[PDB]
Amino acid sequence: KLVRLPGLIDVHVHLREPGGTHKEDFASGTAAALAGGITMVCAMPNTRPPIIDGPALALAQKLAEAGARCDFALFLGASSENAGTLGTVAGSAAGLKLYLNETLSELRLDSVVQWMEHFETWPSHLPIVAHAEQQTVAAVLMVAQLTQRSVHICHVARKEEILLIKAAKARGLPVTCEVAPHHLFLSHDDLERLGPGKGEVRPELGSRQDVEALWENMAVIDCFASDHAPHTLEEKCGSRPPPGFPGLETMLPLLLTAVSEGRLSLDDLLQRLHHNPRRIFHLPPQEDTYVEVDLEHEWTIPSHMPFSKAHWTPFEGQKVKGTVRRVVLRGEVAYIDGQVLVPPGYGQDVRKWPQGAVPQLP
Amino acid sequence: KLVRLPGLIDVHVHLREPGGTHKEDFASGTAAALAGGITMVCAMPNTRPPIIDGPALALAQKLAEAGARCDFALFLGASSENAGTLGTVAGSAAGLKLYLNETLSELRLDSVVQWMEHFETWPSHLPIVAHAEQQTVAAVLMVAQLTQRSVHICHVARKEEILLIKAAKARGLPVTCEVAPHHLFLSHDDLERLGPGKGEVRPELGSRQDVEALWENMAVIDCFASDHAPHTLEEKCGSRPPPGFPGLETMLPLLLTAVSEGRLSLDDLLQRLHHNPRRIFHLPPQEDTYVEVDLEHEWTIPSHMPFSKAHWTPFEGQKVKGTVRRVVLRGEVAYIDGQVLVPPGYGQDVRKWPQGAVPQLP
Ligand SMILES: [Zn+2]
Ligand SMILES: [Zn+2]
Ligand SMILES: [Zn+2]
Ligand SMILES: [Zn+2]
Ligand SMILES: [Zn+2]
Ligand SMILES: [Zn+2]
């Protein structure tokens, strides 16, 4: 009755450690990942302190090695000060992350010249990822061409954005992109229900026409990634709600529902949650690692999923068909039917594996 | 000085066993593969007997398990008689191969309706590969759309073909393709030297404009594959020369030369010889497997490479920069500096590995 899948990869998660551990930490976030059929995550650098230099990366790496229950890589974050300073640690990171729209004080870039400096100084063989909305997608693509390298665009959310990327790919430009589940399964039609606080997310929820354009242009989407952005309900409902949805525990159930409805194939799903993440970020295979799912079980997403400390979900009330039954990670049962069974610290930094280093010319 | 690469994959080799073992057998062909930095091969079904039914597949699987020095998967071949009969063994094969142009009596398909029957009966989740030249590419793409599934086009050789595939990808159609090294590094300009016998290959060598279109449209090429088609010199020079070049031992040196010249990146190469073959054919990772190459060593391709029984090469005289120094396959030294060190039978059928089965809905 079950289906065996390879170990799935989420290349865009915010696990909030160090500095935001009331929202989530490595142990709780990777528990959420395992319960969602995810066995490897790439953690974003907008923590407190942000991962914008070698000492912060060193700290975050040890916190993750001690807290993570699944395997991981850590992004470095581009700042207005660190271009040309990351060469020694660059290869130990998942990649470099550029935050090109409204963001946290330390990751804010004031000028496209600062983008150029990062594209010019970051090692040419290592991944660069950009949070780039609307015309920013076009702008960062221009910077990538001027510096003659590739770029990966995070959470594409709009018809405008996916059609621009489509046009770039038609010209042979080296761009890849990812889409998050809330931009495939939620729209403006849901804002009435969510409210202005819970509904706050960046990129914001799109129109029904945005959602339909993403599905119509599935061929253009290289990866699915949750953009797991845990904030507590108190923060989402308060005066200055931060953007973001939790999503690790709901991503695969939502997508398996789409597969069961014929909206995409099982292969389409596995290209976007396994093969393409591997090849874009040069992430290594995980030995004796697999996920068993039940495609027949129908359930309704509750007000909060078991594991994320976010303790809320924007998908509450949606009917889904598909559930993660068992996860085996490197030969150990990591998850069965609502219980995580590997301790904090079982997870490892895949960039330290010999097969996890990005190949490079001498 | 050396560079470590993952285990490379050649998804298009003719190893001639059973029935053509004077041209090559599993032991000699996989020795050639290892010497070329290849650790996994997909063997084509136009053997004698051809692999067009379960008994022939059973035989070929045992011959490969006994003779192969690297890991492998075996293609099934479409015939005018076997549509609807391969469902029980389909999942044990690399995929289904359709020979849509001039070919061997048993793989000859008389009618596009026979193509349709295979697309309709072959399991929808398993790979289909087509030898399709010129307008045949358009025709098989039409059949793929009518049956609403994907197709992979072998050895794209012409500007006409790569631009058609480019246009199909721009419309979001599920098509992938491979290009062989002789269509990137040889042209009509070389036929004077090769002669009409040695120069016989299908698809035939292209014009300089064909070669330049393939390089210009590298973004459209998903895989490199050798189309290793060993024939003895006596056969290539005789009255009725069969088409094909040997290529396993020269593919990587040629491509590494191109990398060293800046014609493509190391990543471009590894996408096309590792990641994309994996994800198109759902081939499993190989544990503790890697290839060490020396990018500085300049040498001239001789009149024949050491291992292929073909005992000739069309690349004789070309200057290359790049050489395979060491291959480790599943923890054992398989190749060092001109010597293969794993015996016939070390190789395994990757479709029998748990991680080597193609995921499918229940
Ligand atoms: Zn991202
Ligand atoms: Zn994010
Ligand atoms: Zn890689
Ligand atoms: Zn092929
Ligand atoms: Zn062939
Ligand atoms: Zn696969």
Curated annotation (Swiss-Prot), chains A, B:
Q: Which residues bind Zn(2+) 1?
A: H12, H14, K97, D227
**What role does it play?**
Multifunctional protein that encodes the first 3 enzymatic activities of the de novo pyrimidine pathway: carbamoylphosphate synthetase (CPSase; EC 6.3.5.5), aspartate transcarbamylase (ATCase; EC 2.1.3.2) and dihydroorotase (DHOase; EC 3.5.2.3). The CPSase-function is accomplished in 2 steps, by a glutamine-dependent amidotransferase activity (GATase) that binds and cleaves glutamine to produce ammonia, followed by an ammonium-dependent carbamoyl phosphate synthetase, which reacts with the ammonia, hydrogencarbonate and ATP to form carbamoyl phosphate.
Q: Which residues form the active site?
A: D227 (for dhoase activity)
| Span list, region DHOase (dihydroorotase) | 1-329
Remaining remarks = GATase (glutamine amidotransferase) and CPSase (carbamoyl phosphate synthase) form together the glutamine-dependent CPSase (GD-CPSase) (EC 6.3.5.5).
Q: What is the protein's name according to its record?
A: Multifunctional protein CAD
Q: Which residues form a coiled coil?
A: none
- From the record heading the sequence, give the disease linked to this protein: Developmental and epileptic encephalopathy 50: A form of epileptic encephalopathy, a heterogeneous group of severe early-onset epilepsies characterized by refractory seizures, neurodevelopmental impairment, and poor prognosis. Development is normal prior to seizure onset, after which cognitive and motor delays become apparent. DEE50 is an autosomal recessive, progressive disease with onset in infancy and favorable response to treatment with oral uridine.
Name its cellular compartments: Cytoplasm; Nucleus
Q: Which gene encodes it?
A: CAD
Which post-translational modifications are recorded for this protein? Activated by MAP kinase (Erk1/2) phosphorylation just prior to the S phase of the cell cycle, when the demand for pyrimidine nucleotides is greatest, and down-regulated as the cells emerge from S phase by protein kinase A (PKA) phosphorylation.
Effect noted on mutating E178T: Abolishes dihydroorotase activity
- Subunit description: Homohexamer. Interacts with CIPC.
Outline the inducing conditions.
Transcriptionally repressed following hypoxia by HIF1A.
Q: Please give the range of the full-length protein represented by this chain.
A: 1460 to 1821 of 2225
Top-level taxon of the source organism: Eukaryota
**Changing T103A does what?**
Abolishes dihydroorotase activity
